[PDB]
Amino acid sequence: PQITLWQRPLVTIKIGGQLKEALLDTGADDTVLEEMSLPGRWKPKMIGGIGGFIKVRQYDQILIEICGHKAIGTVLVGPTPVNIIGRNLLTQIGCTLNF
Amino acid sequence: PQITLWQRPLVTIKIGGQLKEALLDTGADDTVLEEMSLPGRWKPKMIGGIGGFIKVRQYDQILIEICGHKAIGTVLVGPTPVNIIGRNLLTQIGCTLNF
Numbered sequence A, B: 001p002q003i004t005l006w007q008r009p010l011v012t013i014k015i016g017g018q019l020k021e022a023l024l025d026t027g028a029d030d031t032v033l034e035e036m037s038l039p040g041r042w043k044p045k046m047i048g049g050i051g052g053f054i055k056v057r058q059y060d061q062i063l064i065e066i067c068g069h070k071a072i073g074t075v076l077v078g079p080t081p082v083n084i085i086g087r088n089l090l091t092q093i094g095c096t097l098n099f
């Protein structure tokens, strides 16, 4: 697919057989998803963006699928406004920026 | 260019006769740079992201070159962790996400 940037590049993801919307973000190094209770093991972590830092739980090896493409890796869960797909998963689906 | 995302998408920008590095950021609506003097008149604005809300100065109709592609648009200057080129200027240079 090719996604223009007139609007925010929000797509559907599936994690644990539920669909969510998420922003595809080349500016994020990590993937941050809204609070949910996954089974599995986590570590505490702190991530920093524009206004400062928030606390998140880090889960490793989560499979998500982004517009039909599977990716597996580290997901951070915390109180974000929006679900963020960062470069750790975008590489696995083969995403590029082109101009 | 087609830019992969194995690394952060940093590019060189020319703004106000300086050269700077900035990240091409599809998760950002607007463009925020670190503290600088830009010619022109400005308005206080608030923006937010992970961690909260910051105040910035807004300069309208600033010419910037992103890898030799001109864009003339709003630039916000403020206490940012990284220089972000956001969707407001990424559309002008015809940037898309592809996978």
Ligand SMILES: CSC[C@H](NC(=O)COc1cccc2cnccc12)C(=O)N[C@@H](Cc1ccccc1)[C@H](O)C(=O)N1CSC[C@H]1C(=O)NC(C)(C)C
Pocket: A025, A027, A028, A029, A030, A031, A032, A047, A048, A049, A050, A081, A082, A084, A086, B025, B026, B027, B028, B029, B030, B031, B032, B047, B048, B049, B050, B052, B081, B082, B084, B086
């Ligand atoms: C122009 S700078 C402000 C920008 N925010 C936006 O464009 C969108 O803002 C918002 C949209 C909707 C609801 C919001 C609620 N509260 C705050 C901001 C909101 C922004 O910070 N975008 C970031 C992503 C984002 C969007 C919306 C909420 C929160 C984060 C950026 O793309 C990124 O990846 N950055 C910018 S600094 C480092 C990095 C980053 O935050 N990294 C992570 C996500 C912490 C790993």
